């Protein structure tokens, strides 16, 4: 019984559809894109050309919604990389000592990740993906949404799709501001923090022996230094490839040309390690860029009027600077927030509003982590009323930096820091007495004086071929 319509069949739409099909009789997913039969790039998810880190916090929720997905990913060549044991990371505070595993991430092409999630979701026959279809309007009125009007691209025919619940998951380019204006609702408060960050990515074929068990390698900006923030990330993906994404804020953007890419990875960031490693590998693709890096949030949950039967989640409600790697995990937390409200309130009036407020809570940690570190870069453009960004940014940063510095050299602080950063634990967790006690106990290991690479990792950067 009951029907749901989901706008957008990307990550949030597939996760939310899988969840909803366990609560309603049918789910219809409307997407303007065409979908490949295999793990290919598609125009509706251009960000799949860039490195995607799936932190443990989101991975565990994906697993809860779509059992078997994590193993299916690893089974297809995705890498499980332990954090911090499997990462070689030059943080703002220095090299991270590679303590034993506290958390993990899943490393693969976003195209394979999307394909795996969609194929698993659509095994449920009561979920139908309706491709190459435009969303024209929300049906109903400002009091209650009752479906959507859509247009088949090939035919041109329009039709009404009824729904007891409409969920907008159309991503960063979502048209919900327009759709909700057409209903007669006031505009939501828009909040943004725009560092001017630009991404540049190439794919490489890794040296053959390093195609597995190779670490995630990252060189981070120093958010406290009054210079443009620049980063470089090397991440293993399936079938023996490396995806390498470099990034820079206003005044430090990476160039678009292949030769300037490798130069930036060496000299544009604070340590040349990623540039040194890509010199061991064979480039496979030319440079792809992206400017979709603004932290932007729409406060739908605080609107004076909200229609029954309408929920917005994923990048459509809150989108983040991708260098922090939280977007997919925030979407998953948001799907669970909607599920929690469905279990509590069924489809009573107040469900959609309660879900929208719960979704605002679900994305808040990712929002604070990204915005608190972006707000400081030169020339950052901001629009916010959040006193955590406007009043108490300094002492929050002094607490952040004390934790971040100590996490590089203290196993207990690192465990707490990565639990929060993978969105496996909430912000309050860091106020636990045991964590601040370990912070005060200070470093337990020396600061690494060189990249903490293992000999057996660097040994696999060469073949030994030209040697008798
Ligand atoms: C460069 C970059 C790097 C990133 N790296 C990471 C990372 O390392 N880790 C991480 O967790 N996240 C990362 N993200 C964020 C992640 O890509 C998004 O958070 C995630 O895709 C959000 O899913 P979504 O379903 O809300 O939107 P999307 O995945 O973008 O899906 C939106 C869907 O809606 C459809 N659609 C869009 N507009 C319309 C329309 N008008 N009508 C109909 N259908 C429409 C699209 O075709 C698509 O199918 C990165 C993002 C970028 C840009
Ligand atoms: Cl993009």
Numbering used by the authors: 20 to 487
Sentences from the paper on this structure:
To visualize how the substrate molecule binds in the active site, we determined the crystal structure of Lsd18‐FAD in complex with a diene substrate analogue, 1. The Lsd18‐FAD‐1 crystal structure was solved at 1.85 Å resolution with final R work and R free values of 0.16 and 0.20, respectively. Each Lsd18 contains one FAD, one substrate analogue, and one chloride ion. No electron density was observed for the oxazolidinone head group of 1, and therefore it was not modeled. The conformation of Lsd18 in the Lsd18‐FAD‐1 complex structure is nearly identical to that in the Lsd18‐FAD structure (RMSD = 0.13 Å). 1 is bound adjacent to the FAD isoalloxazine ring and makes contact with Lsd18 residues A70, I72, W74, Y218, H239, V252, and V342. Critically, the re face of the C19═C20 alkene of 1 is exposed to the active site cavity. In this configuration, transfer of an oxygen atom from the reactive C4a‐hydroperoxyflavin to the alkene is expected to produce an (R,R) epoxide, which is consistent with the structure of lasalocid A. We propose that the subpocket, formed by Y218, V252, and V342, and the nearby I72, determines the alkene binding orientation. In our crystal structure, the subpocket accommodates C19‐ethyl of 1, presumably generating binding free energy and promoting catalysis.
